Design a protein around this ligand. Structure first.
Ligand SMILES: [Zn+2]
Lengths: 99, 183, 121, 74, 58, 183, 117
RNA sequence: UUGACCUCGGAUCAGGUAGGAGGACCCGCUGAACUUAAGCAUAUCAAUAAGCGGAGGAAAAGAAACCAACAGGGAUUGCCCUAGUAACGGCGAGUGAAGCGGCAACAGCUCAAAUUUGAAAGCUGGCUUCGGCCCGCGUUGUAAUUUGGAGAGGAUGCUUU
């Protein structure tokens, strides 16, 4: 009982167990007869394009200035270099004079 | 005859069921994914805006700390994170959105094509949550957004946006409201 | 007959294991000839047994201390060397974990701590 | 004989055919105990045996479960 | 009960728990209250000497 | 803010996309075990508001429970039975909370959030390390979870007079003859 | 009213003299820790709800936010100087407000405060 | 051909954990009869005993989807009183609270709902010269900020480590 795909596809070939598994979940998922159970979506809300941002909250000043958290991480590395625990930055040219 | 393992069979039966049932038109629109050319041209721009890795972020911090022991503008990267990107959508701060087609709780991305449509931001459903994670240095990434690019490539972003609203969103227009599957 | 433990702690490992062998071979040879006229030999057996225990204690304590010196930097002590305590005491939260507090809580304690005051009559 | 030796409780209460003890229930992980026999509870309760390890717990608590050695000991 | 009879017959010694308290009863230190607190007078009697209020209720 | 969109979706769970997803997932869960491990929650908004965190130590377990009568009625809820079976399965974890995830004509499906009290990521976090205390061993057996507090009637008001401080503690107090010294 | 087993659930009170000693020792143990401070926190003066006890007046739970701000005591300082604070209670009349900002003003006059470190 | 991602498994791989006991007191589940009503079935017994599950030095409860009708109270718990009152009752047997009031003790908080986005800032393990290096988790969200008698963001000026 091959039946063609509704989206203008191809006459399908699935096994009888594959067809029974489709009919099992379709019986659990069917509203009724008579009325159209599967209508198209009328975009009653996305037809109107929103032109302004949703939130009217102010933008914080931290979005316009350099990073606070990056600054605190920099000074932690400065103290490591001050106390000599972390070696300072070596450019790739100095890496070419290395291993 | 031969016997197949349990998780092996269930992988195939879910693939059959998700493509042959009467799929509502918010999951059926995820079956339509952009072309190979458009995906390649998208990742040509996006790879130029890859976020810094943990190795090279640490190197730059060591560079600036060293100069203090012994001047930049805002970094333009690729925006990721579902909660972050949805907020960038809602404040109209995004210019192009890419949505993975294989988010396995699909409820995390069902509203996302329609939300981008409501605010006017061009979107494209893309193959691979793994591909986007590679672009952004994670295992996975459900959504990827571009907000602002550098001045050297404002033209090719606007060209890529026009290639989405012509090559992808025009074909989707009268087939995103229709139910998928059938039989 | 009896060996004081004060002499036991001073000696090294090979001197212990030789003396322990000397007490054990002596102990075995007594019981062969103790079955007849078990008099002062029986008292010697009691003193021989106690001296064996004192020797075996010093060898074990030296070996356990050498293990605890070896594992002084490693973080996975063997089970025999870990403290016993109780079962529930070993699954209690650590002193530093239970004293750990949130950053918001520390901020309020830093700037508004409990004061010290009095009320006059 | 109806009953044989039981490994757990040491009585001759293990049924031979069923292999289940009438006193403790050896194949069961739990020891058989019922609240309608207070006399049977006090016959097998803690304190009626050797108390081989639990006798050592009260002294170690009194010292705070300390570990170490006294200062200046050999 | 049957545990307590075992300890009466055993040669193991009874472990006498010292009279300890979770909270100390009398203030200590080098401050003003500790150097003038009397061990044998009550809370009300001690605060009367200090001139301080102990209870703020009725 | 993707999770606000998910909260409205779970409200409308008779709708087309949610009935479809609940149908295809209930089919999948029937071939699986009675109690099995889920890598991620099926409703990530619900799990997170119930306490789930993406940390090492948090696990999600999915369980199906038979539905119907015990006309004897089991005063234990199906949710409490879902908690008790998982805690027996994972005797090393602590049941934090549970929520409805699906249902069928024979079974009801719940996802339970568990926390490892021995993982030291959990032990170091002051927001969760209360569960490492041994007064929280097997909260689902003593009725200490959200299902248990509902069925024990631990609510304020004159309606819950018999049960708000413990039902058996209230009965023992009211049935005690209290004799003083100077009567 | 002895239909049930009242024999198994009868409670005597021979610890009445012994519990009083413990309660007085708990107040002495608390005052050893809080040595110059009073044992109990300050509490507001409130009116009893019903028509039966409208004319009577008792101690409440804690001071309202408007009472604290009118007296001049900051909110985040009050729990640290012996003042109980109730966020649920409202004032609803000027008589409840004026009686309590007099009480807090009287507390400050009798209060001696010592610096932090 | 290669390499991801997801999902499901194997391992005498490394690190952990659960069982059992005890159970006077504590938290759930399940649940009986005699008796009384001079017989007995509703009821009582009894939301008890027996049975099952799970904790601690206490447990449980707990910071109002509360009480009230006031000139208002203000998390939870316990004592006295309310009071053999209200209420329900083969309206027989009987059963039987709570609010207010005096006391004891007092303590308040953590999340989810937000974009750090000018920088996952967070965390588990391993190797460690113990100083700091790697792997992994994690964007399907780990830190900081906030928790509705609030709060955020700017601005302004004092006050705190
Ligand atoms: Zn036995």
């Amino acid at each position: 009982t091959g039946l063609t795909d509704p989206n203008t596809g191809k006459p399908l070939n699935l096994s009888r167990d594959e067809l029974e598994l489709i009919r099992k979940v379709q019986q659990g998922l069917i509203p009724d007869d008579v009325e159209d159970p599967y209508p198209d979506t009328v975009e009653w809300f996305t037809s109107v394009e929103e032109k302004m941002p949703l939130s009217a909250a102010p933008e914080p000043k931290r979005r316009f200035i350099p990073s606070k958290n990056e600054a605190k991480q920099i000074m932690k590395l400065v103290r490591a270099i001050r106390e000599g625990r972390i070696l300072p930055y070596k450019p790739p040219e100095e890496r070419e004079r290395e291993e | 005859m031969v016997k197949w393992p349990e998780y092996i069979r269930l992988q195939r039966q879910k693939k059959i069921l998700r493509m042959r049932l009467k799929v509502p038109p918010a999951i059926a629109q995820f079956q339509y994914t952009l072309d190979k050319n458009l995906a390649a041209q998208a990742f040509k721009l996006l790879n130029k805006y890859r976020p810094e890795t943990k190795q090279e972020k640490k190197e730059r911090l060591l560079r600036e700390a060293t100069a203090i022991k012994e001047v930049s503008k805002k970094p333009y990267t690729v925006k990721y994170g579902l909660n972050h990107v949805v907020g960038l959508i809602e404040n109209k701060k995004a210019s192009l959105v890419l949505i993975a087609n294989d988010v396995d709780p699909i409820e995390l991305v069902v509203f996302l094509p329609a939300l981008c449509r409501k605010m006017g931001i061009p979107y494209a459903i893309i193959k691979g949550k793994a591909r986007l994670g590679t672009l952004v240095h994670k295992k996975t990434a459900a959504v990827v957004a571009i907000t602002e690019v550098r001045s050297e490539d404002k033209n090719e972003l606007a060209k890529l946006i026009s290639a989405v609203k012509e090559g992808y969103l025009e074909k989707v227009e009268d087939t995103r409201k229709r139910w998928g599957g059938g039989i | 007959g009896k060996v004081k433990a004060g002499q036991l702690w001073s000696k090294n490992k090979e001197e212990l294991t030789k003396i322990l062998g000397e007490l054990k071979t002596e102990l075995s040879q007594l019981r062969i000839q103790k079955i007849s006229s078990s008099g002062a030999k029986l008292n010697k057996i009691h003193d021989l047994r106690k001296s064996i225990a004192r020797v075996l204690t010093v060898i074990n304590a030296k070996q356990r201390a050498q293990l605890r010196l070896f594992y002084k930097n490693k973080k996975y002590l063997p089970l025999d060397l870990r403290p016993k305590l109780t079962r529930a005491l070993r699954r209690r939260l650590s002193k530093e974990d239970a004293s750990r507090v949130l950053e918001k809580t520390k901020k309020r304690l830093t700037h508004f701590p409990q004061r010290k005051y009095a009320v006059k009559a | 004989k109806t009953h044989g030796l039981c490994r757990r409780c040491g009585r001759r209460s293990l049924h031979n055919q069923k292999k289940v003890c009438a006193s403790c229930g050896y194949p069961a992980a739990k020891t058989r105990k019922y609240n309608w026999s207070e006399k049977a509870k006090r016959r097998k309760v803690t304190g009626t045996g050797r108390m081989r390890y639990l006798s050592t717990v009260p002294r170690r608590f009194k010292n705070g479960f300390r570990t170490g050695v006294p200062k200046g000991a050999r | 009960r049957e545990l307590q009879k075992r300890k009466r017959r055993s040669s193991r010694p009874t472990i006498r728990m010292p009279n300890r308290r979770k909270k100390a009863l009398n203030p200590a230190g080098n401050n003003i209250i500790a150097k003038s607190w009397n061990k044998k007078e009550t809370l009300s009697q001690n605060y009367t000497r200090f001139g301080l209020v102990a209870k703020l209720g009725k | 803010g993707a999770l606000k969109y998910l909260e409205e979706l779970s409200k409308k769970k008779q709708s087309d996309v949610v009935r479809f997803l609940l149908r295809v997932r209930c089919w999948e869960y029937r071939q699986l075990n009675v109690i099995h491990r889920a890598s991620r929650p099926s409703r990530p908004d619900k799990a997170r508001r119930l306490g789930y965190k993406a940390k090492q130590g948090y696990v999600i377990y999915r369980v199906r429970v038979r539905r119907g009568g015990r006309q004897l009625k089991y005063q234990r809820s199906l949710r409490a039975t879902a908690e008790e079976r998982v805690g027996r399965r994972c005797s090393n974890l602590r049941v934090l909370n549970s929520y409805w995830v699906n249902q069928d004509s024979t079974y009801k499906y719940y996802e339970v959030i568990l926390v490892d009290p021995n993982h030291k990521a959990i032990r170091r976090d002051p927001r969760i390390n209360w569960i490492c205390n041994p007064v929280h061993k097997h909260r689902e057996c003593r009725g200490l979870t959200s299902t248990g507090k509902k069925s024990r009637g631990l609510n304020k008001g004159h309606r819950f007079n018999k049960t708000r401080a413990g039902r058996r503690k209230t009965w023992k107090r009211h049935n005690t003859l209290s004799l003083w010294r100077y009567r | 009213h002895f239909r049930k087993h009242w024999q198994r659930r009868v409670r005597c009170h021979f610890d009445q003299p012994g519990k009083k000693v413990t309660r007085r020792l708990a107040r002495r143990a608390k005052a050893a820790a809080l040595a110059p401070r009073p044992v109990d926190k300050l509490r507001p003066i409130v009116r009893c709800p019903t028509v039966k006890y409208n004319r009577r007046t008792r101690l409440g739970r804690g001071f309202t936010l408007e009472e604290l701000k009118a007296a001049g005591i900051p909110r985040l300082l009050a729990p640290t100087i012996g003042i109980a604070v109730d966020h649920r209670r409202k004032n609803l009349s000027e008589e409840s407000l004026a009686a309590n900002v007099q009480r807090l003003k009287d507390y400050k006059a009798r209060l001696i405060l010592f610096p932090r470190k």
